Amino acid sequence: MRVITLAGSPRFPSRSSSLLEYAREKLNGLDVEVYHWNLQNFAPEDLLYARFDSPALKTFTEQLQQADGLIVATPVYKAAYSGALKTLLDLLPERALQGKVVLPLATGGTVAHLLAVDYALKPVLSALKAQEILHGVFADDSQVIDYHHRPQFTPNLQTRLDTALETFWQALH
Amino acid sequence: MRVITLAGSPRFPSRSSSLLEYAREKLNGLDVEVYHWNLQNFAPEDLLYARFDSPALKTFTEQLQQADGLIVATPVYKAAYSGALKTLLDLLPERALQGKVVLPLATGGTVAHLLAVDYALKPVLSALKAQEILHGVFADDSQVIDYHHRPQFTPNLQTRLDTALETFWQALH
Amino acid sequence: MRVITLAGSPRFPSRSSSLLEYAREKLNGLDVEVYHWNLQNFAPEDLLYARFDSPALKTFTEQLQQADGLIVATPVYKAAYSGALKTLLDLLPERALQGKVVLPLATGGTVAHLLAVDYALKPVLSALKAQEILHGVFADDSQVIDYHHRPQFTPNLQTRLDTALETFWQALH
Amino acid sequence: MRVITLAGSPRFPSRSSSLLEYAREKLNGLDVEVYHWNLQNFAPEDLLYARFDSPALKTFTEQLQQADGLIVATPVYKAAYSGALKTLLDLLPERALQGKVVLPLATGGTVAHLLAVDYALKPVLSALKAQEILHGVFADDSQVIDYHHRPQFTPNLQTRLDTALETFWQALH
Numbered sequence: 165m166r167v168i169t170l171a172g173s174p175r176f177p178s179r180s181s182s183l184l185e186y187a188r189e190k191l192n193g194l195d196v197e198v199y200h201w202n203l204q205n206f207a208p209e210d211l212l213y214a215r216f217d218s219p220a221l222k223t224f225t226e227q228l229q230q231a232d233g234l235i236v237a238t239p240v241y242k243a244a245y246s247g248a249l250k251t252l253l254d255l256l257p258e259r260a261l262q263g264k265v266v267l268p269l270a271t272g273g274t275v276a277h278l279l280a281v282d283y284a285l286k287p288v289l290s291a292l293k294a295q296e297i298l299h300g301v302f303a304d305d306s307q308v309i310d311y312h313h314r315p316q317f318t319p320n321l322q323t324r325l326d327t328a329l330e331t332f333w334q335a336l337h
Numbered sequence: 338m339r340v341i342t343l344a345g346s347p348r349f350p351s352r353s354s355s356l357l358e359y360a361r362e363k364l365n366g367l368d369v370e371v372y373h374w375n376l377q378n379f380a381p382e383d384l385l386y387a388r389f390d391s392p393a394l395k396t397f398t399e400q401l402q403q404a405d406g407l408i409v410a411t412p413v414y415k416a417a418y419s420g421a422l423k424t425l426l427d428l429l430p431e432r433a434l435q436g437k438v439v440l441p442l443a444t445g446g447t448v449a450h451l452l453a454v455d456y457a458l459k460p461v462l463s464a465l466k467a468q469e470i471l472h473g474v475f476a477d478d479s480q481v482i483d484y485h486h487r488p489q490f491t492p493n494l495q496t497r498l499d500t501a502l503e504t505f506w507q508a509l510h
Numbered sequence: 511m512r513v514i515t516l517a518g519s520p521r522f523p524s525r526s527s528s529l530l531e532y533a534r535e536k537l538n539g540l541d542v543e544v545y546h547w548n549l550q551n552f553a554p555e556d557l558l559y560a561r562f563d564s565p566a567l568k569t570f571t572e573q574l575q576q577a578d579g580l581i582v583a584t585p586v587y588k589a590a591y592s593g594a595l596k597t598l599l600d601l602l603p604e605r606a607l608q609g610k611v612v613l614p615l616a617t618g619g620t621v622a623h624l625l626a627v628d629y630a631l632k633p634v635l636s637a638l639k640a641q642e643i644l645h646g647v648f649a650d651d652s653q654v655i656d657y658h659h660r661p662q663f664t665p666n667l668q669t670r671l672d673t674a675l676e677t678f679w680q681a682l683h
Numbered sequence: 684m685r686v687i688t689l690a691g692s693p694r695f696p697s698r699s700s701s702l703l704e705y706a707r708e709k710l711n712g713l714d715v716e717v718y719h720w721n722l723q724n725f726a727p728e729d730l731l732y733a734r735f736d737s738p739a740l741k742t743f744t745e746q747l748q749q750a751d752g753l754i755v756a757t758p759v760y761k762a763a764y765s766g767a768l769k770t771l772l773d774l775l776p777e778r779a780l781q782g783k784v785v786l787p788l789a790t791g792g793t794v795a796h797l798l799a800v801d802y803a804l805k806p807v808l809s810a811l812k813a814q815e816i817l818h819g820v821f822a823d824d825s826q827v828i829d830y831h832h833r834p835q836f837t838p839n840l841q842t843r844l845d846t847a848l849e850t851f852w853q854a855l856h
């Protein structure tokens with residue numbers, strides 16, 4: 165019914181955010197209230213100094229609470245998720261994703277770090293008590309032909325995105 | 338509705354198996370067809386030398402394929418799942434858990450090894466292409482009052498098993 | 511000969527930093543040039559927006575290059591290292607720890623997350639090509655009796671610290 | 684100087700074993716006493732049913748204890764080390780690798796599973812109390828030109844093995 169999408173790259177434009185964009189598009193047809201957030205909606209001072217009286221944190225935290233699902237995207241940095249993304253996750257309440265379906269998306273420079281999603285990001289999402297976590301979609305940088313403007317992907321990436329998004333849509337019932 | 342239960346303990350009875358026995362009991366209550374497998378169903382030489390023509394592997398494989406969901410249980414050895422269970426997972430086809438809901442259970446000598454589920458078992462189950470992986474249940478040995486004659490758990494662990502099984506049943510629609 | 515120490519908690523005072531403090535003390539006797547850094551030496555805007563033209567980054571990056579070793583401390587947040595710490599690590603060059611001995615220290619609220627060091631922090635340090643990574647020291651919050659003033663630890667924690675620091679000192683030759 | 688080499692592959696000859704054979708050869712060149720073990724030294728039933736009275740386990744254990752360092756090699760199965768190797772690691776005493784330098788080697792069908800070394804194998808070796816764990820070497824199968832009759836590697840992989848072995852030898856002082 166409601167879905168939070170969360171872009172986790174500190175950079176803009178972002179290759180991994182182009183994956184969230186295609187997802188957002190897909191849902192915006194199916195009349196689902198999609199609330200999109202990126203790191204630029206928070207004050208860097210709040211995230212870095214772990215400040216829970218953050219006003220932006222509160223609004224986000226509120227909107228998450230009412231969400232049925234989360235789609236979250238990260239670049240791979242040093243074989244794991246972005247630090248930047250993590251600093252926000254660290255401010256969520258202990259059971260923040262209790263009862264929600266979670267779909268993780270990632271882009272990375274090398275195929276050699278495909279496993280960063282399963283080994284690094286999923287356990288954090290799980291510590292936040294995600295009720296179920298989908299297989300997810302990792303894409304190396306060669307899969308994204310264009311993102312500065314409209315996202316363009318190889319049919320392989322697009323198809324895998326499609327499949328995941330279909331599974332997520334079903335799981336939200 | 339078909340579910341496979343898979344005991345990953347090298348000994349029998351085990352603490353981790355008592356969790357599956359309790360699971361079996363609750364799912365039979367709902368007219369799910371439950372099929373139990375343990376490591377004692379395979380010849381040690383077939384698993385330890387990765388022999389793909391193992392007759393039991395072919396039977397397990399046909400059974401898994403027809404199954405809608407999998408509950409797998411392991412003890413926690415050296416900060417991970419058991420090698421023993423892993424010998425069998427290594428012999429399954431590449432997409433063996435595609436289209437399937439997976440619930441992982443585990444028991445551990447110390448709470449210090451709780452992260453073994455998220456950081457070690459889950460990524461293996463995801464390499465097999467599990468469609469979705471539930472939060473799961475970890476119990477340190479002190480929560481399993483009896484695993485020999487009748488599964489008996491502390492109230493907290495029994496409540497967490499029930500919450501997990503209810504989520505797992507709902508997922509199978 | 512030279513050692514970087516790096517406090518990774520966004521908070522001050524810090525329980526995990528008290529572990530670095532005892533380490534710093536230990537080395538300051540043995541005439542080793544110890545360069546200490548915490549996250550407060552960087553601008554939160556630089557870390558969050560991934561800015562490599564950071565002046566503080568340069569100085570740190572320079573001092574690391576000449577260091578024989580790194581001792582790094584993190585609180586456990588959401589079953590992994592701090593996001594805050596990670597945002598700095600993400601700005602280091604790809605082979606930043608090539609040729610260095612690395613000792614990781616951590617404090618966490620629950621024993622249940624002892625494995626966050628080995629499963630989450632070590633692989634990042636390794637992606638940065640640490641030449642060798644020591645076993646490390648994890649301490650749950652009950653081990654630290656006092657840190658607002660002088661650090662006070664249980665003899666168990668202190669002894670394990672001692673042992674690790676001895677091993678690190680030897681490895682720096 | 685005593686080193687144990689331990690082949691974790693369930694088949695022989697294996698790609699991962701060719702790395703150890705090359706290692707053996709280089710260390711004998713330096714009058715290190717090298718002791719090679721593989722899974723074929725143990726009875727499959729002892730490993731798969733965790734039987735502690737395995738005579739070979741007692742011999743391996745005495746040998747490990749007297750050893751200064753360990754080089755262990757595994758193929759990468761389902762995003763991790765082999766279950767087969769893990770069955771043997773599960774049977775070693777709690778502090779088996781205390782006081783020891785460990786070098787991990789691995790080979791994989793795809794570069795996509797490179798993180799199996801850091802995210803899966805290393806935490807197991809650290810649960811055994813390895814004093815220090817070197818960066819190690821991962822090679823995808825395409826880097827091993829021959830493992831049957833004479834180990835032959837691409838120049839890049841041979842250079843990385845040499846760098847690792849030189850670090851390992853230096854560590855043994």
Ligand SMILES: Cc1cc2nc3c(=O)[nH]c(=O)nc-3n(C[C@H](O)[C@H](O)[C@H](O)COP(=O)(O)O)c2cc1C
Pocket residue numbers: 173174175177178179180181238239240241242243244271272273274275276277305560600601637
């Ligand atoms: C600071 C930084 C660190 C990176 N480290 C890795 C890495 O460890 N492994 C990898 O495969 N790619 C690495 N890359 C490449 C990115 O993960 C890749 O280009 C990704 O698509 C960027 O996504 P984004 O546009 O959303 O930032 C790194 C990139 C940056 C900027």
Ligand SMILES: Cc1cc2nc3c(=O)[nH]c(=O)nc-3n(C[C@H](O)[C@H](O)[C@H](O)COP(=O)(O)O)c2cc1C
Pocket residue numbers: 346347348350351352353354411412413414415416444445446447450478733773774810
């Ligand atoms: C060979 C062996 C190794 C073990 N290593 C660990 C360990 O590393 N960490 C831990 O928490 N418990 C360890 N234990 C204890 C088991 O995790 C715990 O007692 C478990 O519940 C036994 O489960 P089972 O009866 O299903 O086999 C080990 C037990 C055995 C037999």
Ligand SMILES: Cc1cc2nc3c(=O)[nH]c(=O)nc-3n(C[C@H](O)[C@H](O)[C@H](O)COP(=O)(O)O)c2cc1C
Pocket residue numbers: 214254255291519520521523524525526527584585586587588589590617618619620621622623651
């Ligand atoms: C934002 C936040 C998240 C935390 N999450 C966890 C956690 O997942 N697991 C845990 O054991 N402790 C958790 N804790 C407790 C801390 O890890 C623990 O109190 C630690 O000693 C703090 O160290 P520091 O003073 O250096 O910040 C968390 C604490 C904070 C402030």
Ligand SMILES: Cc1cc2nc3c(=O)[nH]c(=O)nc-3n(C[C@H](O)[C@H](O)[C@H](O)COP(=O)(O)O)c2cc1C
Pocket residue numbers: 387427428464692693694696697698699700757758759760761762790791792793796824
């Ligand atoms: C049962 C089995 C499972 C495998 N699964 C994977 C895998 O999940 N990921 C991967 O990268 N390679 C996988 N492979 C390929 C091996 O990782 C690769 O070919 C390896 O180098 C074989 O090493 P070995 O000859 O030392 O046994 C698998 C091979 C076998 C026999």
